[PDB]
Design a binder for these strands. Sequence first.
DNA 1: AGGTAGTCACAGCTGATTGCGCTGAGGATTAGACGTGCGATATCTATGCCA
Length: 53
Amino acid sequence: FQAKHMDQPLPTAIGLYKNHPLYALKRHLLKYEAIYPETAAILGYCRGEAVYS
DNA sequence: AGGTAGTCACAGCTGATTGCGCTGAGGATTAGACGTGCGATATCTATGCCA
């Protein structure tokens, strides 16, 4: 199941990247949660929105 | 027999008493998230325009 569902659909809708840890959009975080640019530079894009692990 | 020290009966000084105030411990007491509603906005394709 993990192998099948590892980034298979490849969604590119802004709403889908929210509350989705597999994508973890920078703008779709919380006040207390924050990205780490050291281990996440770029993994994908959606309407000019970068993806971080 | 004589006078002032010991003894007892009362006076000033001061501490305890009785109203009342104050602290210290002790037990009582709407702001980012999470969504949607509305509104501005990208977005895909029919199809007939005349060269």
